[model samples]
Target: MDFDAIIIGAGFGGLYSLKKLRDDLNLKVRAFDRATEVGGTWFWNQYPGALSDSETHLYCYSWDKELLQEMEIKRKYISQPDVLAYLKRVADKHDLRKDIQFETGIRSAYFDEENSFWNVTTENDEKFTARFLITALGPLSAPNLPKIKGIETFKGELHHTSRWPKDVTFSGKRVGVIGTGWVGVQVITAIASQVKHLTVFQRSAQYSVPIGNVVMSETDVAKIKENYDQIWENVWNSALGFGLNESTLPTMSVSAEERDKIFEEAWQEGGGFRFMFETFGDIAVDETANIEAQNFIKKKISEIVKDPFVAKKLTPTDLYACKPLCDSGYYEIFNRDNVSLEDVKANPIVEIKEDCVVTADGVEHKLDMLICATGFDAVDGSYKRIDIRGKDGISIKDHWKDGPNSYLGMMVSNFPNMFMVFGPNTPLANSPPIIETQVEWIADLIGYAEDHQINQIEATKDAVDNWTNTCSDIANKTLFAKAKCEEFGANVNTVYLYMGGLKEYRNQISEVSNNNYKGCLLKQ
Candidate 1:
């Protein structure tokens, strides 16, 4: 075999997997990433005002205690450069780059039934074989570029948030941004000051909270360092893996004034996940509770935006059940004289002229450039783009034609000796902890396989079916499903992720691992 394991991606998941598989399991591993450098998703998503929604202290690895102590974080929320630099430092310290093929992309990978190994083909036509295949493909890395008529004819600059160029600038340019996702909100807040004129084409109104970011003092760092162990313990056991002590108190149980105060404190303290998970418990499950949050945000929007009409346009009427967003003066940006909002959902985009956008209302809004923060195809998008075949020549696309599913969000039924981090049905939680959990589980599972002389380990079809049903059922119980919010990385009617909270997910995966990997089939 070319190696003991072949790993895909170099983000947090992939990097940690490389370290674990090599150092802990003592396996000869080779990792591949298309980017010329490390920092998987962070390497590419270098858009204006790109910031971590997770707090700086909690967004990092909990595995390396010494590394955690040594690394210094001076901000409440981490920016793109800080995150990329942190990953690079980890890679350099551990010497993980030597075994990684930077600038290389996987073309296809198939399991060889006779050999009981994975045969991987690179885009450059390089071939390799390995006993295990681990994929750390980030869930939101794949760009969901939209199609529009006359887009090609637009001579001005155009770019997607995921594929933002390093040299691109919107200073003094008439910028028109399409889509008001979390990324879009960041861009609008950051560039609204620099751009000559800014127009936002909002598909739907978002309920965003203030990011209340601040410079961390020495005392803050010391406090976090002291509480690192307790923090991680709580984080692993917490509902959202955000290290927040989630309020178990239901929203409607409290008086309106009391509920308003809790929401206000969370909003002022900063963090989107904090507000949703820590302020109230039933906001995601109960419509009445969800309505309270919706009204509070709408109230904030009305107060912040100067124009009454724009405020109404910006306030979302749906359940406040989408992924909560934190922004640095996102709503206040609308108060700028140069900034304007276009409700694209109410008035659809007609077409793009040479230097402007034509709306259904027959108004031509001119622009020097267009920015699309249109999000991603999500969990299974990048996987389906490749030719991945498993036992009996079953394609992954064929397996997931209805929707993506995996046993414990790691192993698929037909893909033997294959594991995934940030796979389908992953918890919608702070990613690093969950990524670490998945990576460590995968590494341990491989170690178990080797110890038992197991040649092939595949999730059973019965297990996959049961787990898929589990995911959809848990998801359906939430208002996110009832509202059909696109936050969980699924289409309106599709159940593509696990919404049972990280605490339960950890318990479930831990039980499975502790029970000798009960849900999987081990071929000796």
Candidate 2:
């Protein structure tokens, strides 16, 4: 297959990339996904109670106001299946699927220095050459399967949360779940009622807020739909892009009573990360202020969970270090008679024996099935997994061995004519809107390439170095990097952890914009 552009993964990013390339740039774009269908993560994660944590109104595409107005989101935070159907409808309306190659994975992508094009080879051994390669692999697309001993020896069914086996029934079966991240919480809460017995192995406690989701009223829906343009502008200007609340003073400057009241209002509003934006402007930067916020969260958890010990165990002490989770019924699941929590940090999982997990303390817990919700490799994982070679046969993985280096999270140095959607150091702030901005940037670059008959473009090494240093400098000032020594720096197991503070990161990108970033294009 041959095309003007090639996009990897058919998630929100890939779908939008295809549409923008086709409609705005008038370019022939071919998209590929390993799944048999579109909807990327939604395609694979069909486990019980799989739903988007992001609100429906802001989580959607804003490019086409007509589509936004016409489409009715079934729920405020829709289930995975429903969201997948919505994506399908959007693809059908735009005639995007015809150009997308499903069940095909690109194994390797090598840049041709002489030809100035990317030579992409798929797992099927088919080759395609394109002027530009757009990697739209979502941050959480790759599942991080734990390397547990005797994992393959399990007689009963075993499943990774990211890639749950379809048609597998956990009903009436004893299940053991490892890791209590966002997906882990969701999976446990979902299957607690059905499973005969459920064991949860938690290494670290995560901060989770109740997601107050409800059916959107016609009036509420209309209000957003009518002012979609203005809403987006407001979201972009706001801290984390929801336009919920703004902090008037730094957290340290506020009195404890006043801070608690502020946190109370944010908690009631029911949005994750909004509390960070509301309680203090510098919570991410100042440790003292972040500790105050963490205390407030602990108080909330203590009030909600009822059991002081369980609440304390569930509460995070690191103060907005890790990403906060928004869930519907996380804490409530612990109240179940059949549910059990094992603190792995205290008593580590030594091995996985047949239908049983043996801990370091020699305690054994029997289970019929095992579910591993061990998160993902995150930002750079998918990009590094593929054998992508740039100028002079240099691997992109090797280039980023130290860490990901990108100019405003759009273009990588020495990687010409390639753009990464939801790339490194881009804001976790308002993902859908950030994605829209990224797509627009790519589209603008494509137009520039076409107008100048430029076959290739790449960020200068110096430009990337400057951007990386700037991002690191900004991140160092935030509590996200300083609060947790292990998770945010050299101590982290994965490369994604080295980065910090998405709010400041987003502002940096916004400053670079589409027209201002330093880059070079190969002349015709």
- Candidate 2, 1-524: lDDT as tens digits: 27899999898889999999987889888999998888887888887778786778777788887788887765677788887887898899999989999999899999988888899999999999998999998755454555788777778778887777778787789899897887888888888888999999999887776677788888888887888888777777765666556665788676778878888877787766666665567766677777777787787778777777877778775566566677777888887788888889889998888768899999878888888875655577788789999998899889888877677677888888889887775655666777887888778878877887778778888777776676666566665554443322333222232143335555555465444444544456
Q: Please write out the lDDT profile of model 1 over residues 73-109, one tens digit for every residue.
A: 8799899999999999999999999999999999999
Q: How accurate locally, in lDDT, is each candidate?
A: 0.88, 0.77
How high is each candidate's TM-score? 0.98, 0.92
Clashing residue pairs, backbone N/CA/C < 3 A, model 2:
284-479
Error of 1 at 199 (Å): 1.1
Taking every candidate in turn, the Cα RMSD to the unseen true structure, in Å, is 1.3, 2.8
To one decimal, what is the Cα RMSD in angstroms of model 1 from the true structure? Answer: 1.3
The prediction achieving the highest lDDT against the true structure is 1
lDDT, model 2: 0.77
- Over 4 Å off, model 2: 141-143, 483-517
